[PDB]
Structure formats: C-alpha cells, structure tokens
Amino acid sequence: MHRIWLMYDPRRVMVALVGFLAVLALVIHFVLLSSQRYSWIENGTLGADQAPVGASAPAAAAEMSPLPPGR
Amino acid sequence: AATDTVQVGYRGTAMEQNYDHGDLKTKFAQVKLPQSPPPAGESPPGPLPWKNVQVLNDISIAEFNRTMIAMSTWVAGTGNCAYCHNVAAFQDDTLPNGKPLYTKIVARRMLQMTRNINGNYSQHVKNTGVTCYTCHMGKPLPNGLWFYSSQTDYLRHYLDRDGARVITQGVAPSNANRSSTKQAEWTYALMISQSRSLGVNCTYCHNTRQFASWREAPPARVTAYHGILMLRDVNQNYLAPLQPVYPAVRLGAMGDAPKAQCVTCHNGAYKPLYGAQMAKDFPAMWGRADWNGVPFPGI
Ligand code: BCL
Numbered sequence: 001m002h003r004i005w006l007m008y009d010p011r012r013v014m015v016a017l018v019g020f021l022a023v024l025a026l027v028i029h030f031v032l033l034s035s036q037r038y039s040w041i042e043n044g045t046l047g048a049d050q051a052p053v054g055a056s057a058p059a060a061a062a063e064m065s066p067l068p069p070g071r
Numbered sequence: 072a073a074t075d076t077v078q079v080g081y082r083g084t085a086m087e088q089n090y091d092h093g094d095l096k097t098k099f100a101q102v103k104l105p106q107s108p109p110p111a112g113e114s115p116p117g118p119l120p121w122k123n124v125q126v127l128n129d130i131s132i133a134e135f136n137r138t139m140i141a142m143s144t145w146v147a148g149t150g151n152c153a154y155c156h157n158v159a160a161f162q163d164d165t166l167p168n169g170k171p172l173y174t175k176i177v178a179r180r181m182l183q184m185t186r187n188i189n190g191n192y193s194q195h196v197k198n199t200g201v202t203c204y205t206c207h208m209g210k211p212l213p214n215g216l217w218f219y220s221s222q223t224d225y226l227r228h229y230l231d232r233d234g235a236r237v238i239t240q241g242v243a244p245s246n247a248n249r250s251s252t253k254q255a256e257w258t259y260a261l262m263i264s265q266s267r268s269l270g271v272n273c274t275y276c277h278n279t280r281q282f283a284s285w286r287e288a289p290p291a292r293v294t295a296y297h298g299i300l301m302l303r304d305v306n307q308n309y310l311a312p313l314q315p316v317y318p319a320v321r322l323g324a325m326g327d328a329p330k331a332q333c334v335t336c337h338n339g340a341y342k343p344l345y346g347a348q349m350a351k352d353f354p355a356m357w358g359r360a361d362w363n364g365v366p367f368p369g370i
Pocket residue numbers: 020021022024025026028029032038
C-alpha cells in the first residue's frame with residue numbers, strides 16, 4: 001500500500017490532508033460550541049445530569065429584538 | 072401603455088405616483104359598474120315596535136327598514152334577509168332548531184364596529200366614512216383576512232404590537248436607539264405591505280431622503296398613522312373577540328378569528344372605493360351627531 005506514494009506526490013497529499021483535518025476539526029468544534037448541550041465555554045462546568053437534553057427546537061431564541069443595551 | 076402620474080411633493084424631488092393608464096381604468100370601471108345604489112329615505116313619526124333591537128335604537132322605523140335593505144345588498148345580495156334572519160321571526164337570534172343565528176349576532180357587532188369607526192376614527196375616515204360595503208363589497212367575506220401564523224408576522228402591528236421606529240433622532244449613536252438592521256428590514260417589509268394595500272409607493276407618505284421626517288412627508292402620513300391605531304381597536308375589540316361566535320370553518324388553524332388590515336378597506340386603492348361617499352346617506356351608521364353639518368335625524 002506504500003505504492004500510493006509513488007502515484008501521488010506526498011508533498012501535495014499532506015497539504016490536502018492537513019487542510020481536510022483542519023476544516024473537519026474546526027467544523028465540529030464550532031458545531032458543538034453552538035449547541036446547547038456542548039457549549040463548554042459557557043456551561044462546561046455543569047454535570048452531565050444537569051446539562052441540556054432534547055433542545056433541538058429550531059427557534060429556541062427570539063429572532064427579533066433591539067441590540068443589547070449599549071453602554 | 073401610457074402612464075398617468077400624480078405629483079405629491081415639491082418640484083424635482085421625484086415624489087410622484089405612477090399608474091398604468093389601462094390597468095387603472097379597468098380597476099376603476101370594475102368599481103363603478105357594481106357600485107350599489109342607495110334607497111331614498113323618508114321621515115315618519117311614531118314609537119318603535121322592536122322586540123330585540125339593541126344598537127339601532129335611535130333611528131326612525133323607516134330609516135331602520137331602509138338600513139336592513141342596505142345591509143342585505145352590501146353583505147348578502149339584495150333582499151336576502153334569510154342570510155341573517157329566521158325570516159318568520161326577525162327578532163330571533165336563533166334558528167327554530169335553537170341553534171344560534173351566528174351571522175345575525177356578528178352583524179350586530181359589525182354595526183357597533185362601524186359606528187365606532189365612523190365616530191371615534193374620523194381623523195382617519197373623515198367625511199368619506201365606511202359602510203358594510205367598504206369591506207364586504209356584496210359578499211360575506213372581505214379581502215385581506217389574516218390569522219396567527221408566526222411570531223414575527225408583521226400584520227401583528229395591527230393587533231398586539233406597537234413600536235415600528237428604527238431611526239435615531241440625533242447625529243451620534245445613543246442608548247436611546249439600539250434598533251437592529253433586522254428591525255429596519257421588518258419595518259421595510261411592513262411598509263411594502265402598506266404601499267401595496269393602497270396601490271401607492273413610498274413617496275406617498277415619505278420624502279425618502281429622511282423616512283423619519285414628518286415635515287418633509289405629505290400629510291397622508293398622518294392619516295396613515297391614525298389608520299394603524301384604528302385597526303388595533305377594530306382587531307382587538309371587535310374582530311378578534313368574535314372567536315366563539317363563528318363556525319370553525321371561519322377560524323384559523325390556531326382557532327383564532329379572522330382579522331382585518333389596510334387592504335381590507337382599501338383593496339389596492341388610495342381611498343376605499345376610490346373615495347365613493349356612502350356613509351353620509353345612512354345615518355344609522357354615523358356614530359356621529361352630524362355628518363358634514365347634516366344633523367343626525369334622531370327619532
Ligand atoms: C461531545 C463530543 C463529540 C465529538 C467531538 C469531536 C471534536 C471536537 C473533534 C472530533 C474529531 C473526530 N471525531 Mg468525534 N465527537 C463526537 C462523536 C463522534 C463519532 C460518533 C459516531 O459518535 C465519531 C465516529 C467521531 C469521529 C471523529 C473522527 C472523525 C475525528 C478524530 C479522529 C480521526 O479522524 O481519526 C482518524 C480515524 C477515523 C476517521 C475513524 C474514526 C474511528 C473509527 C471507529 C475507526 C474505524 C474505521 C473508520 C470508520 C473508517 C472511516 C474512513 C476514514 C477514511 C478513516 N466522533 C461527539 C458528538 N470529535 C476531531 C476531528 O475532527 O479531527 C480532524 C475533533 O477535533
């Protein structure tokens with residue numbers, strides 16, 4: 001299977017691999033950070049018994065409002 | 072293919088209404104030809120015989136019968152007293168089966184609503200006024216009926232919402248106004264609906280160089296604001312509480328009653344019925360002590 005490196009130049013494959021792993025990790029971290037259950041920066045300290053479950057409703061927050069008070 | 076234009080602001084500001092001349096003539100003739108003509112009216116003496124009359128207490132017996140003929144032709148087609156009544160017993164509010172005559176008990180509320188419009192909202196309807204014909208136009212259902220659907224539906228500006236302003240009345244940013252650009256999109260959507268409801272463009276009520284300006288705007292903007300306040304009263308106090316009265320075929324998916332909006336009266340014209348003055352001919356519906364100096368012929 002090492003002959004894959006004879007048909008593909010490993011110089012080019014490793015850039016595509018690094019880029020693919022980079023976008024995949026970033027997508028998954030951003031997906032989780034936007035979820036209710038896994039917003040670890042705000043709620044990471046909650047125990048698993050008190051983390052959100054079933055919060056899949058597609059409009060959990062008010063769509064329309066003023067900006068927060070501006071100070 | 073000729074275009075009619077009306078200038079509504081100062082020279083060179085391009086505050087103008089444009090109409091396709093052919094399209095407008097067909098719309099206008101389509102009003103003229105069906106426009107229902109009024110009975111002549113007359114002046115007897117004598118005391119009122121009515122068994123179950125609760126709104127029209129204050130008009131002569133001839134004026135009452137004249138009003139019922141009008142109501143028939145405006146809502147149900149002419150002489151169709153069977154639409155509202157158990158015609159053997161006009162005083163009844165129920166069928167012989169005991170089941171209620173829902174149209175009659177709605178129509179009694181629609182009389183109070185019409186009087187309330189013509190009386191308390193004269194800053195909007197002035198001396199044109201409204202009759203049943205304005206909305207119904209000869210049919211049981213008016214145009215532009217609306218029901219609950221989504222929270223951000225802009226037609227709730229005509230019911231239970233209030234604020235629409237988004238522009239700051241000062242040069243610098245302030246905590247007074249934290250409106251989002253999304254809120255300006257919401258007002259813009261609302262304002263397109265009002266423009267289409269009258270068949271006008273934004274320059275009919277605004278100088279668009281400053282939408283917030285009242286001095287630069289035509290006076291129609293002040294009439295338009297009173298229209299919003301009128302619809303909130305019409306919807307909140309008269310149309311929406313009729314929910315338990317209608318058959319479920321009339322109700323919305325939330326079970327709510329049908330509500331009105333600008334297009335319900337205006338039907339795409341700058342005034343309802345292009346300004347046809349009918350309320351003056353029917354004192355039963357004035358809600359007002361005189362109509363343009365003509366005194367109410369009370370009993
Ligand atoms: C609450 C925690 C989150 C979560 C948070 C994160 C975060 C945050 C990250 C990952 C990352 C990854 N997650 Mg995870 N992840 C969750 C649940 C899962 C589930 C699952 C079905 O439940 C799976 C399959 C995965 C799988 C993966 C991998 C694709 C990846 C890291 C290893 C890797 O690529 O190695 C190579 C190995 C594989 C791709 C195979 C995985 C292991 C399997 C079982 C081995 C068998 C053969 C395999 C299926 C063959 C597939 C074909 C491939 C070409 C190899 N996660 C839950 C929902 N996961 C990281 C990432 O994206 O890195 C790039 C990352 O940063």
